[PDB]
Amino acid sequence: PETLDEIYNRKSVLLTLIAVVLSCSPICEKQALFALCVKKVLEKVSETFGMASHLDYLVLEWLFILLNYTNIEDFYRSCYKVLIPHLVIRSHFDEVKSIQEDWKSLLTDCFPKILVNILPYFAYEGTRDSGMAQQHLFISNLPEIVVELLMTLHEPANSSASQSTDLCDFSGDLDPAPNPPHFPSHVIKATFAYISNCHKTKLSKSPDSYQKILLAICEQAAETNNVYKKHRILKIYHLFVSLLLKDIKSGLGGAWAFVLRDVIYTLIHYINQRPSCIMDVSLRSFSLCCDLLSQVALENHLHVIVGTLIPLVYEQVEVQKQVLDLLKYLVIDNKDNENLYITIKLLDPFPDHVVFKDLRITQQKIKYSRGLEEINHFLSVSVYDALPLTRLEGLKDLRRQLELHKDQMVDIMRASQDNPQDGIMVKLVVNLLQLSKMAINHTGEKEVLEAVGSCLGEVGPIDFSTIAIQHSKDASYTKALKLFEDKELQWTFIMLTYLNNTLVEDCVKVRSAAVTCLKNILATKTGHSFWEIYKMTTDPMLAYLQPFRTSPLSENHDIWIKTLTCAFLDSGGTKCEILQLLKPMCEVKTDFCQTVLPYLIHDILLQDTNESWRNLLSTHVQGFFTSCLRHFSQTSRSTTPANLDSESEHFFRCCLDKKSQRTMLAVVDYMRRQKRPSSGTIFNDAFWLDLNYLEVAKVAQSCAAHFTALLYAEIYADKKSMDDQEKRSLAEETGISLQDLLLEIYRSIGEPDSLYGCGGCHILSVYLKGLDYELEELHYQAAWRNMQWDHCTSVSSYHESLYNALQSLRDSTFYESLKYARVKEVEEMCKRSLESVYSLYPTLSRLQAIGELESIGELFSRTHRQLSEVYIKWQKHSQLLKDSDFSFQEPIMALRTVILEILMEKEMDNSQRECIKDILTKHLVELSILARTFKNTQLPERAIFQIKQYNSVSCGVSE
Question: What secondary structure does DSSP assign to 781-826, as a single string?
Answer without folding.
Answer: HHHHHS-HHHHGGGG--HHHHHHHHHHHT---HHHHHHHHHHHHHH
